[PDB]
Design a protein around this ligand. Structure first.
Ligand code: HEM
Ligand code: HEM
Lengths: 146, 146
């Protein structure tokens, strides 16, 4: 069975990703936390309220609320209410969050360099075409994926 | 995150496989049951004891014992002790098991025809090369997979 063969692989690869992240001290920056950190970092001119965060990650209000409170717990951001309207919550990347941001870019660079060692942009493009076609063949009517 | 993107896909594909199997009435023949049925079917000259079954699927004694008792429950096989030594258990495919065997070959034919529609042997070979390389890159020392 290739199903079970495939699941087991992704799980093992997730294991590797996680250890790699520990090693770079950019744990907890795997998924959505890292996305918000890199958003904040790259656009310091602009602000992000929690409402902006929901839209930027396409997540629900309660989920967003849990995320940012986790990020705050981690010390990556400060949550400061709009001085003009204290129902609006702004997120600001801390010193620690900016450190994590620069660490995260490094990590992502080395991770891809390691993972994609010995593999061409062509090979990848093929890979993507195959997966997407499979997905198409099997889903039929249900083809509403990523 | 491609991890979560990838897991979700395989899960959805498993969903499709399962419904396809129901439709062909070859449910429960997904994995190891189907392998033993097709082994029995293709080699009627030879016999398979439960001990042979363990070796043919590389599974433990207790696991094998559960499998074949499930297969018996399903009506796919008869479990009959060696007439000469009643500690040896032989498996025999029933009429229903032979029907399932011929159904299973059909199913597998149509499944691949559907899934691999619009995809070349080349594309596949590339796919396999990429996956295996990824696996190699990330596992390092731990490269002892399928
Ligand atoms: C936390 C995990 C990961 C994150 C956050 C992530 C994020 C990214 C980002 C932002 C890019 C865009 C690169 C660019 O052109 O600047 C990228 C590209 C890519 N990623 Fe990942 N990635 C992750 C894990 C993986 C994994 C596990 C794989 C495969 C196993 C993978 C394969 C790729 C490939 C093939 C590209 C395309 C390179 C290109 O077009 O230049 N990534 N990833
Ligand atoms: C219960 C599920 C499945 C079983 C039991 C199964 C079994 C098999 C077997 C026996 C073959 C050998 C074909 C031959 O040359 O005679 C095969 C080939 C193949 N299978 Fe599957 N398969 C399953 C599901 C899948 C899935 C889900 C995929 C991909 C999504 C897949 C992709 C392939 C490919 C690409 C080949 C190679 C064709 C060739 O070399 O001629 N299979 N499978």
């Amino acid at each position: 069975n290739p199903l079970q063969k495939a699941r087991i692989l992704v799980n093992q690869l997730e294991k590797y990703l996680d250890r790699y992240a520990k090693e770079y001290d950019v744990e907890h920056l795997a998924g959505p936390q890292g996305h918000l950190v890199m958003h904040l970092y790259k656009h310091p001119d602009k602000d992000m309220s929690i409402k902006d965060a929901e839209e930027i990650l396409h997540i629900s209000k309660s989920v967003a609320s849990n995320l940012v409170k986790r990020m705050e717990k981690n010390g990556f951001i400060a949550i400061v209410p709009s001085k003009t309207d204290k129902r609006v919550k702004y997120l600001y990347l801390t010193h620690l969050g900016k450190q994590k941001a620069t660490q995260f870019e490094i990590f992502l660079e080395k991770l891809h360099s390691t993972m994609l060692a010995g593999i061409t942009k062509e090979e990848i493009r093929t890979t993507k075409k195959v997966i997407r076609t499979l997905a198409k063949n099997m889903a039929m009517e249900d083809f509403d994926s990523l």
